[PDB]
Design a protein around this motif. Structure first.
Motif, PDB file in Angstrom:
ATOM      1  N   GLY E  48       0.797  -1.213   0.000  1.00 27.17           N
ATOM      2  CA  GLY E  48       0.000   0.000   0.000  1.00 27.17           C
ATOM      3  C   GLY E  48       0.832   1.267   0.000  1.00 27.17           C
ATOM      4  O   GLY E  48       0.370   2.305  -0.487  1.00 27.17           O
ATOM      5  N   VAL E  66      -7.204   4.929  -9.815  1.00 24.20           N
ATOM      6  CA  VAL E  66      -7.109   3.479  -9.648  1.00 24.20           C
ATOM      7  C   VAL E  66      -6.852   2.791 -10.992  1.00 24.20           C
ATOM      8  O   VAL E  66      -6.009   1.889 -11.090  1.00 24.20           O
ATOM      9  CB  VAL E  66      -8.375   2.970  -8.924  1.00 24.20           C
ATOM     10  N   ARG E  80      -1.596  -3.477  -7.183  1.00 24.36           N
ATOM     11  CA  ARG E  80      -3.008  -3.300  -6.826  1.00 24.36           C
ATOM     12  C   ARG E  80      -3.705  -4.636  -6.567  1.00 24.36           C
ATOM     13  O   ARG E  80      -4.387  -4.809  -5.542  1.00 24.36           O
ATOM     14  CB  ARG E  80      -3.734  -2.530  -7.931  1.00 24.36           C
ATOM     15  N   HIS E  83      -2.323  -6.177  -3.488  1.00 21.58           N
ATOM     16  CA  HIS E  83      -2.914  -5.571  -2.296  1.00 21.58           C
ATOM     17  C   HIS E  83      -4.297  -6.131  -1.989  1.00 21.58           C
ATOM     18  O   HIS E  83      -4.606  -6.407  -0.822  1.00 21.58           O
ATOM     19  CB  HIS E  83      -2.997  -4.059  -2.464  1.00 21.58           C
ATOM     20  N   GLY E 130     -10.540   0.568   3.709  1.00 21.38           N
ATOM     21  CA  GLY E 130      -9.781   0.456   2.485  1.00 21.38           C
ATOM     22  C   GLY E 130     -10.526  -0.111   1.300  1.00 21.38           C
ATOM     23  O   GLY E 130     -10.068   0.049   0.166  1.00 21.38           O
ATOM     24  N   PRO E 134     -10.916   2.183  -4.086  1.00 28.18           N
ATOM     25  CA  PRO E 134     -11.395   2.222  -5.473  1.00 28.18           C
ATOM     26  C   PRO E 134     -12.856   2.631  -5.492  1.00 28.18           C
ATOM     27  O   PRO E 134     -13.729   1.846  -5.117  1.00 28.18           O
ATOM     28  CB  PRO E 134     -11.186   0.791  -5.982  1.00 28.18           C
ATOM     29  N   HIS E 182      -7.381   4.639   6.649  1.00 29.73           N
ATOM     30  CA  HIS E 182      -6.863   3.400   6.088  1.00 29.73           C
ATOM     31  C   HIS E 182      -5.348   3.423   5.991  1.00 29.73           C
ATOM     32  O   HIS E 182      -4.703   2.375   6.107  1.00 29.73           O
ATOM     33  CB  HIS E 182      -7.467   3.162   4.707  1.00 29.73           C
ATOM     34  N   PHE E 183      -4.764   4.600   5.782  1.00 26.50           N
ATOM     35  CA  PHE E 183      -3.317   4.700   5.857  1.00 26.50           C
ATOM     36  C   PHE E 183      -2.833   4.578   7.303  1.00 26.50           C
ATOM     37  O   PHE E 183      -1.866   3.856   7.557  1.00 26.50           O
ATOM     38  CB  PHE E 183      -2.858   6.007   5.207  1.00 26.50           C
ATOM     39  N   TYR E 273     -14.611 -11.537   3.566  1.00 26.87           N
ATOM     40  CA  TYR E 273     -14.340 -11.634   4.993  1.00 26.87           C
ATOM     41  C   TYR E 273     -15.424 -10.991   5.842  1.00 26.87           C
ATOM     42  O   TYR E 273     -15.551 -11.328   7.024  1.00 26.87           O
ATOM     43  CB  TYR E 273     -12.994 -10.992   5.314  1.00 26.87           C
TER      44      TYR E 273
HETATM   45  C1  HEM Z   1      -0.757   1.309   5.785  1.00 23.88           C
HETATM   46  C2  HEM Z   1      -0.673   0.540   4.702  1.00 23.88           C
HETATM   47  C3  HEM Z   1      -1.717   0.578   3.660  1.00 23.88           C
HETATM   48  C4  HEM Z   1      -1.924   1.537   2.720  1.00 23.88           C
HETATM   49  C5  HEM Z   1      -1.156   2.804   2.496  1.00 23.88           C
HETATM   50  C6  HEM Z   1      -3.032   1.149   1.942  1.00 23.88           C
HETATM   51  C7  HEM Z   1      -3.463   1.960   0.890  1.00 23.88           C
HETATM   52  C8  HEM Z   1      -4.435   1.547   0.016  1.00 23.88           C
HETATM   53  C9  HEM Z   1      -4.830   2.223  -1.149  1.00 23.88           C
HETATM   54  C10 HEM Z   1      -4.242   3.519  -1.637  1.00 23.88           C
HETATM   55  C11 HEM Z   1      -5.814   1.492  -1.734  1.00 23.88           C
HETATM   56  C12 HEM Z   1      -6.555   1.830  -3.004  1.00 23.88           C
HETATM   57  C13 HEM Z   1      -5.818   1.371  -4.262  1.00 23.88           C
HETATM   58  C14 HEM Z   1      -6.447   0.119  -4.803  1.00 23.88           C
HETATM   59  O1  HEM Z   1      -6.108  -0.956  -4.373  1.00 23.88           O
HETATM   60  O2  HEM Z   1      -7.374   0.201  -5.769  1.00 23.88           O
HETATM   61  C15 HEM Z   1      -6.039   0.360  -0.925  1.00 23.88           C
HETATM   62  C16 HEM Z   1      -6.981  -0.601  -1.226  1.00 23.88           C
HETATM   63  C17 HEM Z   1      -7.281  -1.631  -0.345  1.00 23.88           C
HETATM   64  N1  HEM Z   1      -6.663  -1.947   0.799  1.00 23.88           N
HETATM   65 FE1  HEM Z   1      -5.090  -0.980   1.589  1.00 23.88          FE
HETATM   66  N2  HEM Z   1      -3.509  -0.022   2.380  1.00 23.88           N
HETATM   67  C18 HEM Z   1      -2.767  -0.437   3.421  1.00 23.88           C
HETATM   68  C19 HEM Z   1      -2.890  -1.591   4.189  1.00 23.88           C
HETATM   69  C20 HEM Z   1      -3.965  -2.447   4.031  1.00 23.88           C
HETATM   70  C21 HEM Z   1      -4.244  -3.554   4.843  1.00 23.88           C
HETATM   71  C22 HEM Z   1      -3.428  -4.011   6.024  1.00 23.88           C
HETATM   72  C23 HEM Z   1      -5.398  -4.136   4.353  1.00 23.88           C
HETATM   73  C24 HEM Z   1      -6.087  -5.327   4.872  1.00 23.88           C
HETATM   74  C25 HEM Z   1      -6.884  -5.230   5.931  1.00 23.88           C
HETATM   75  C26 HEM Z   1      -5.810  -3.385   3.223  1.00 23.88           C
HETATM   76  C27 HEM Z   1      -6.947  -3.661   2.504  1.00 23.88           C
HETATM   77  C28 HEM Z   1      -7.269  -3.006   1.324  1.00 23.88           C
HETATM   78  C29 HEM Z   1      -8.370  -3.424   0.456  1.00 23.88           C
HETATM   79  C30 HEM Z   1      -9.307  -4.577   0.689  1.00 23.88           C
HETATM   80  C31 HEM Z   1      -8.378  -2.571  -0.583  1.00 23.88           C
HETATM   81  C32 HEM Z   1      -9.314  -2.580  -1.760  1.00 23.88           C
HETATM   82  C33 HEM Z   1      -8.700  -3.472  -2.841  1.00 23.88           C
HETATM   83  C34 HEM Z   1      -9.303  -3.157  -4.178  1.00 23.88           C
HETATM   84  O3  HEM Z   1     -10.399  -3.574  -4.468  1.00 23.88           O
HETATM   85  O4  HEM Z   1      -8.611  -2.413  -5.049  1.00 23.88           O
HETATM   86  N3  HEM Z   1      -4.921  -2.341   3.057  1.00 23.88           N
HETATM   87  N4  HEM Z   1      -5.174   0.412   0.150  1.00 23.88           N
END
Ligand code: HEM
Ligand code: HEM
Ligand code: HEM
Ligand code: HEM
Lengths: 297, 125, 79, 48, 380, 51, 80, 56, 380
Positions: E48, E66, E80, E83, E130, E134, E182-183, E273
């Motif tokens: 992330g 995105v 992406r 993640h 998070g 998107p 979320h960050f 989940y």
């Molecule tokens: C601090 C670290 C993290 C940052 C900076 C971060 C940042 C982001 C960003 C910018 C997105 C949107 C981009 C994208 O995927 O379309 C995102 C999506 C997401 N993040 Fe994180 N994230 C972090 C940690 C986590 C963790 C630990 C989880 C799990 C619980 C998580 C779960 C998700 C999910 C489920 C999405 C949506 C996925 C999708 O459909 O695209 N993230 N995150």
């Protein structure tokens, strides 16, 4: 030492004790003992050592009169035969936590008697040296494992040994330590061993060569241990090596020579580990092996 | 040296167990000579008896024939290793040559029904 | 809580051997698959009929959704 | 939708071949480091 | 000279934690999931971190940013989908760690379990915060439904709904606020993982046998470091097969539409989940009861140290409790299946019976199974 | 410095010359392999063509 | 006593070059070490591939985008 | 000496030789593994990729 | 029955670090600045939490999001100007902490000092990297100038500056890169401060007199937590005087235009904690020498453990080393004024002479000053 000989040479004739186990003492009758006397007490496997005060022609006349025609020919031409014994790097750990002091030995297979490098493995073993808690040298002692041990109060005693048999030896260190510093003694012992094995110096090897020369002449001072050396040297080395030839073998040993044949007989080898006492803070055998071979070299 | 093999064995003169022998091993060799002497004297007495007109009934050869013929199923125990290895050795190449025969004949029937394979001079099929 | 002061165990010994002097896979493919089948026999009677009933209620739910989405031919067929 | 698709299957095949060439070797490294505990035989020696 | 690992305090922390830790020699592949959760949390933080270098949070260009991540920047599709599938792997390892804790009777590490329950609260909070990022149809309407569930609290609930919304609906301020939350929340999870290790390291670690096993203890290095490496490689095999071969089967397809409040999807679900969470909240027709049953169904793992009535620690020597635990696991899988469909016949009945069975297995049936276990195995 | 300059430390440094120089070539070859330098990888004949 | 302790039969675990008691282990010591360190090095080359290639993917993602590479080329001034 | 014994004695016992073997085999593994993986990928689809339709 | 602050392990490390830590009783108001940096980092983290909830990171509306924070967001002007003047408060507390570290003999806490200068490098990097984020003309051209001065190195310079830019200039990927970096960096600064406190608590604190303080020890509570509260209240007095009365005085007024690449400010100038850095970079005529003087200027106070030639620890009993220390901080003030001044004859010769004299004080004249202290007090 008996646990180390049991766990170092398992499945071989060197696993057993000299005394024998209690289930084997109780069945020893007279005919097995006289079979052992008729087999293994044969005359050319016997030497007659005298040391001082004697005359050799008088001893040979008395040996013609008395110790001649003992036994030479076997019973059914069944000769005994020496075998190359397997060294198995292993770990035995008798855990007795109510017992006060932990005795732990670590040994690698050394070359033995007939191989000529017992002098250079002994000069590495004498650079490492020995300590007991009654020694009044203190922190200023020359061996750095003993200096570190009395600096941070690690162990009560440690003794570095080169026990040799025909082509197979145990060379290592046995320490009487407390229950709380076996990890420290194992780490500093392997660190001193492979600091010796990587960075041997000329001052260190001339200290060891001087202490070996003094240790051999102090061993062969007395009449009873010089007869022990005469009998052990005549049974093992074939001839008896005089101390001028021992001095000539000592004076050719340098730090470069010590470094490579230490790399032969020390580096990345699996040791045998024995322990009686509170052996909880002994490291496990993979930590012994990771503490052997060095992270830098 | 000369390395041993299961198919090129160590000879007894080069064997290390012939050179470090014990009086119990020598007593075993004396008893082996004694039992070979007893069996040889019984065989030679039955050889040179002139009252004998039939053959020599060899009891160990009868024992070997009986063990290779009619002892194997009375001495069967069903183990999983024997069951799995016998099931593989009795089933496996039938499915393997089934796949080979069905693949080759599906290829041949497909090429005949599509016309790519030609029987030019093939009269006796 | 470190080594040495964990517990008092007396009169035990522990034989071992080196990692190098033994095989890394001591009888894996033969004589590990009976151990896998023995552990599977030991725990599959307590694992499996919950998974049998999750497949049964999955089949019941998907079949009941497929039947209930389709209209009946009994009511409003003759008006 | 997926302009990365052929590169995704190429990097997935690179991952699958590197993990087929990697995973039994690190399983052998785990079993090699665990052979001491997998052949750690025990005994009891009571003082009677 | 001195021992560096027991002399340097930064090396003393890693020597007491990961090198010379007294660990039991018993522990199975299920005990590797804690280090798998830590490593996959670290790769979620790194993933992330490298995903937020092109992400823009606003109500117009979040889906454009995105898709700029997905196809325009060099190899951002891997980051992406890594993640998304690593959030799925994060919850796979978290649910199997929670199932290991129920499986082997580690409720007696009470403050360790309560710190873990606060981790589960924060992981579910950052996963919901998070999934909106998107800015799609499924993300918009799932956040609309889940943040509209908080209006069922009487007299303060709608004020809390407009407080967490920042306005009359889910919008630009809600998306940037959920981006900030979320960050920031995985670093709260990382500090809670540090205090999870700190509360673990004085009480020791459990074994599958379930005994105080201080006689048979091995160092953590190199045994559990090489088991960590093997678990990292098999978790990365399942993870890289999840991203580079099957990237969007766990993810919902309606996330890939652009978000619009004029059109709603016909079936509203979160990702997989939260499906047992949606199965808990869809069962009761009273929505305040659904919120209270949701908070109770996650906090009942925290109350589970007070439902340890049997005199045996692990469940492995308890066969009736193994039957109830695996029917609990199958009932949680029933909840995970039933949370994704609309309320139809007989799915409301199946979810209602599953929710009262999920409460009844935990509350009464497993303590009375422990009592029946002790009275059958002569502990009275 | 003044206690670190001596004959024994020079002999220990001479003993530690080849393995530290080989670790320096390990770091140089690993830096070359990590960064993929176009001047250096075009001299190796196995990666001679275009990569 | 101490002399009644014997290490039991390790024939099911030990290697075939160590399994005979009439031979020394120093002849096959280099063979077993050069097999197990070959297993370690052949693991470590794939670990170095997984630590090089993923880091290169992340570094090239931290580098400039393909849209920025398309827009950074200027308009062609041509012959006139 | 057998096949792994000489390479243990000359390039595996020291950690610097071990890391040099790891890095040189890493470079050779990079080029040979990328060539083999792209060869088996273009064998699993010859004509579907942009190479071998680039005649246009 | 038992004490909770020595039984419970989180309370054990909280009690050991905070309650009855053995601390010297004679420390002045200058020792409060480390805990002032801790609470100032916490107020920077919480104002960034409440600032990034309405911040959109893209170059079309970053400045529009900043003006939406300052005008349309309720109490958003207080959060943004409190964050900027709390960065100024953070750097004046950091400069007084490092002036205390240069003064009172605490070079010799060596691992503490080395992880301190790693922390100081990370604090300066996140300060510039968050100063880009309002997206003004001064912020964009300061980003262009500071990153363009990293391109002086041959063969890695243009690869490094397109790597840190994501293009030929500062753009949308650069701003989202700097916003993701400005999120992630103060949490690793806080973890570095936690392990900096651990490396302090290995050997305790020190006195102003440079002596062994083990004879006279007071507990940290309640003797130093009320001095902490008094320091927190005077720091919040100066910080709240900075936000509520003079908000753009320590900031630059030229930042508050929309960012335009088609024009340049008449003098380009970074922030007031980077002014001595910009003067040291402007002093060397070679650009690679300027960036090497930058890195050596930040790193040269880490060589102060190796530049302790005197047998007395502190500078309390060193009277002309005090003269050289106050002429060092005079050179720092002259460097700050010279970096605030534009590049004209004769500010360049004043900056050259003051940077040469500052490096002569920090390298040459203070070890020979310690030598002449121990020569004038007859040590040898
Ligand atoms: C601090 C670290 C993290 C940052 C900076 C971060 C940042 C982001 C960003 C910018 C997105 C949107 C981009 C994208 O995927 O379309 C995102 C999506 C997401 N993040 Fe994180 N994230 C972090 C940690 C986590 C963790 C630990 C989880 C799990 C619980 C998580 C779960 C998700 C999910 C489920 C999405 C949506 C996925 C999708 O459909 O695209 N993230 N995150
Ligand atoms: C936030 C994600 C989590 C991380 C990173 C994490 C990390 C760890 C680690 C590293 C261990 C030690 C390794 C081991 O003994 O297995 C561990 C063990 C443990 N964790 Fe967690 N954990 C997490 C979630 C949870 C949750 C949600 C619970 C509560 C159900 C929990 C309860 C425990 C318990 C009770 C143990 C010790 C007994 C056992 O391992 O079987 N953890 N955890
Ligand atoms: C900006 C974040 C920083 C924080 C939160 C911080 C925190 C602290 C704390 C809490 C103390 C103990 C003082 C007390 O509680 O009474 C301290 C002391 C110390 N710090 Fe820092 N510090 C920071 C920056 C630095 C830097 C950059 C350096 C390196 C120049 C440094 C070097 C020291 C030294 C040498 C001491 C011991 C002498 C003294 O107590 O004043 N600190 N710090
Ligand atoms: C992790 C905690 C932090 C977060 C989330 C954060 C977030 C932000 C955000 C969103 C902005 C842009 C809004 C604005 O224009 O003011 C910003 C600006 C800024 N931040 Fe931070 N920040 C954090 C910590 C810090 C720290 C520790 C410093 C001090 C070194 C700092 C110094 C600045 C500066 C100087 C600005 C520019 C102020 C301006 O010109 O408007 N930030 N920060």
């Amino acid at each position: 030492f008996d646990y180390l000989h049991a766990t170092a040479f398992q499945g071989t004739p060197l696993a057993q004790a000299v005394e024998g186990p209690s289930e084997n003492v109780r069945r020893l009758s007279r005919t097995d003992l006289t079979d052992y006397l008729n087999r293994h007490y044969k005359a050319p496997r016997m030497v007659l050592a005298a040391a001082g005060g004697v005359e050799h022609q008088q001893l040979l006349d008395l040996a013609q009169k008395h110790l001649s025609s003992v036994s030479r020919v076997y019973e059914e031409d069944a000769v005994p035969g020496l075998t190359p014994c397997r060294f198995t790097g292993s770990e035995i750990r008798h855990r007795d936590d109510a017992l006060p002091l932990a005795h732990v030995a670590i040994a690698v297979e050394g070359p033995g008697w007939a191989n000529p490098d017992n002098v250079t493995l002994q000069v590495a073993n004498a650079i490492i040296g020995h300590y007991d808690c009654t020694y009044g040298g203190g922190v200023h002692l020359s061996s750095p494992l003993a200096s570190v041990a009395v600096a941070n109060k690690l162990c009560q005693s440690f003794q570095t040994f080169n026990i040799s048999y025909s082509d197979t030896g145990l060379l290592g260190a046995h320490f009487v330590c407390d229950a709380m510093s076996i990890d420290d003694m194992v780490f500093f012992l392997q660190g001193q061993w492979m600091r010796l094995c990587t960075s041997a110096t000329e001052s260190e090897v001339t200290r060891g060569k001087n202490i070996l020369r003094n240790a051999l002449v102090s061993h062969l001072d007395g009449t009873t241990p010089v007869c022990e050396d005469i009998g052990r040297s005549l049974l093992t080395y074939g001839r008896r090596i005089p101390l001028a030839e021992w001095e000539s073998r000592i004076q050719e040993v340098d730090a470069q020579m010590l470094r490579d044949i230490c790399s032969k007989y020390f580096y990345d080898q699996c040791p045998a580990v024995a322990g009686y006492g509170p052996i909880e803070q002994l490291p496990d055998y993979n930590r012994i092996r990771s503490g052997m071979f060095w992270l830098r070299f | 040296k000369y390395k041993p093999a299961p198919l090129a064995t160590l000879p007894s003169t080069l064997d290390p167990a012939e050179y470090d022998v014990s009086p119990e091993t020598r007593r075993a060799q004396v008893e082996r000579l004694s039992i070979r002497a007893r069996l040889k004297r019984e065989y030679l007495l039955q050889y040179n008896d002139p009252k004998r007109v039939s053959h020599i009934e060899d009891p160990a050869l009868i024992r070997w024939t009986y063990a290779r013929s009619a002892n194997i199923y009375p001495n069967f125990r069903p183990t999983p290793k024997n069951s799995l290895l016998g099931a593989v050795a009795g089933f496996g190449p039938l499915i393997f040559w089934y796949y080979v025969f069905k693949t080759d004949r599906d290829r041949k029937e497909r090429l005949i029904q599509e016309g790519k394979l030609d029987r030019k001079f093939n009269i006796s099929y | 809580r470190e080594f040495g002061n964990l517990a008092r165990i007396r009169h035990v010994i522990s034989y071992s051997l080196s990692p190098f002097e033994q095989r890394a896979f001591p009888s894996y493919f033969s004589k590990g698959i009976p151990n896998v089948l023995r552990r599977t026999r030991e725990r599959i009677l307590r694992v499996a009929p919950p998974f049998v009933v999750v497949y049964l209620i999955y089949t019941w739910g998907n079949q009941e959704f497929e039947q209930s989405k389709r209209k009946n031919p009994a009511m409003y067929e003759n008006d | 939708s997926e302009p990365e698709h052929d590169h995704r299957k190429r990097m997935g095949l690179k991952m699958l071949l590197m993990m087929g060439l990697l995973l039994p070797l690190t399983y052998a490294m785990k079993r090699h480091k665990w052979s001491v505990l997998k052949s750690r035989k025990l005994a009891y020696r009571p003082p009677k | 000279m001195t021992n560096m690992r027991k002399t340097h305090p930064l090396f003393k922390i890693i020597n007491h934690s990961f090198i010379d830790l007294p660990a039991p020699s018993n522990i199975s592949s299920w005990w590797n999931f804690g280090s798998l959760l830590g490593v996959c949390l670290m790769v979620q933080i790194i993933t992330g971190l490298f995903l937020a270098m092109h992400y823009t949070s606003d109500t117009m260009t979040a889906f454009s940013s995105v898709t700029h991540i997905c196809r325009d920047v060099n190899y951002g599709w891997l980051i992406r989908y890594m993640h998304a599938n690593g959030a799925s792997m994060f919850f796979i390892c978290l649910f199997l760690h929670v199932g290991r804790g129920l499986y082997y009777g580690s409720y007696t590490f009470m403050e360790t379990w309560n710190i873990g329950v606060l981790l589960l609260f924060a992981v579910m909070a950052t996963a919901f915060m998070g999934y909106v990022l998107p800015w799609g149809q499924m993300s918009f309407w799932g956040a609309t439904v889940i943040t509209n569930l908080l209006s069922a609290i009487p007299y303060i609930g709608t004020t809390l709904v407009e407080w967490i919304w920042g306005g009359f609906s889910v919008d630009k301020a809600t998306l940037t606020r959920f981006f900030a939350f979320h960050f920031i929340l995985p670093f709260i999870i990382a500090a809670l993982a540090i205090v999870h290790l700190l509360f673990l390291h004085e009480t020791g670690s459990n074994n599958p046998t379930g005994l105080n096993s201080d006689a048979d203890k091995i160092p953590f290095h190199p045994y559990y470091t090489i088991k960590d490496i093997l678990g990292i490689l098999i978790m990365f095999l399942i993870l890289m097969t999840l991203v580079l071969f099957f990237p969007d089967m766990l993810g919902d397809p309606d996330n890939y539409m652009p978000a619009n409040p004029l059109n709603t999807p016909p079936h509203i679900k979160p990702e997989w989940y939260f499906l047992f969470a949606y199965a808990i909240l869809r069962s009761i027709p009273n929505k305040l009861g659904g919120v209270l049953a949701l908070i109770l169904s996650i906090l009942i793992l925290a109350l589970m140290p007070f439902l340890h009535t049997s005199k045996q620690r692990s469940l492995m020597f308890r066969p009736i409790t193994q039957i109830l635990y695996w029917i609990l696991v199958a009932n949680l899988l029933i909840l995970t299946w039933i949370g994704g469909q609309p309320v139809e016949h007989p799915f409301i009945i199946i979810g209602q019976l599953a929710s009262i069975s999920y409460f009844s297995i935990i509350l009464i049936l497993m303590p009375i199974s422990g009592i029946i276990e002790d009275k059958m195995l002569k502990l009275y | 410095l003044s206690r670190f300059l001596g004959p024994r430390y020079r002999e220990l440094a001479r003993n530690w010359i080849p393995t530290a120089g080989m670790w320096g070539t390990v770091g140089a070859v690993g830096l070359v392999w990590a960064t993929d330098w176009r001047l250096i990888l075009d001299w190796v004949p196995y990666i001679n063509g275009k990569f | 006593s101490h002399t009644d302790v014997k290490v039991p039969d390790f024939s099911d675990y030990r290697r075939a070059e160590v399994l005979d008691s009439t031979k020394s282990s120093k002849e096959s010591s280099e063979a077993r070490k050069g097999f197990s360190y070959l297993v370690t090095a052949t693991t470590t080359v794939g670990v170095a591939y997984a630590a090089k290639n993923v880091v290169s993917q992340f570094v090239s993602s931290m580098s400039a985008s393909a849209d920025v590479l398309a827009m950074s080329k200027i308009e062609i001034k041509l012959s006139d | 000496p057998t096949i792994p014994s000489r390479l243990y004695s000359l390039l595996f016992r020291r950690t610097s030789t071990f890391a040099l073997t790891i890095a040189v085999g890493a470079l050779f593994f990079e080029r040979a593994f990328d060539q083999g993986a792209d060869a088996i990928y273009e064998h699993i689809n010859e004509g579907k990729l942009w190479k071998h339709i680039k005649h246009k």
